[PDB]
Symmetry: C3
Subunit: 82 residues, 3 copies
């Protein structure tokens, strides 16, 4: 059954051929992936949404300050009879 062995070998060669192709693809895919060492994880970062919320709170405080200052400027104008 030498011909039978020859058939099993060709089957094996085709399996290997497709595996080698899949490995070539995999290696390329892996090179497009980010390393753990080069990135930060979610626990280490604020999102845009979170930063926006923090910034909006600062804006609010600044606007309250601007209103206070404007009131003071008019209080001064009143004191100066001006």
């Amino acid at each position: 059954g030498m011909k039978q062995i020859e058939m099993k070998i060709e089957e094996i060669l085709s399996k290997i051929y497709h595996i080698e192709n899949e490995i070539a693809r995999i290696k390329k895919l892996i090179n497009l992936k980010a390393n753990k060492a080069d990135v930060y994880t979610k626990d280490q970062l604020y999102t845009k949404t979170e930063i926006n919320s923090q910034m909006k709170q600062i804006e609010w405080k600044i606007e309250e300050i601007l209103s206070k200052i404007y009131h003071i400027e008019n209080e001064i104008a009143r004191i100066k009879k001006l």
Copy 2:
């Protein structure tokens, strides 16, 4: 030694079987990994700790301003004899 060849073939088939299984696993693993193109690296980002430090400095400045404004309001009250 046809039986001997048959043994080597079965050994090879089992090696291939396990390789194919490992490749299937790998492909699934890879699909769960983040692409370099979709993420920022550490050099491009501030952490929560860094943002917190920056925000705390802004808070400090705002509190110094609020204290200045409160002093000015009382200076005005004193000028008004009020």
Copy 3:
């Protein structure tokens, strides 16, 4: 042609040997890659450059406020003839 079969088998064994080595390497590489589940993507994050721009705008507003307050302090000094 038993010797011919023996040659094809050794060729196959060497192909498998190198594949197994490449798979071992791949598995190690994959373990160094970041998971999608553990990271944020670009659309979800501000970069250092963007945060710096936002912070610089806050600094600008704070400096404008400090200048306003300094002017008011001197207006008060003038009112007090002091």
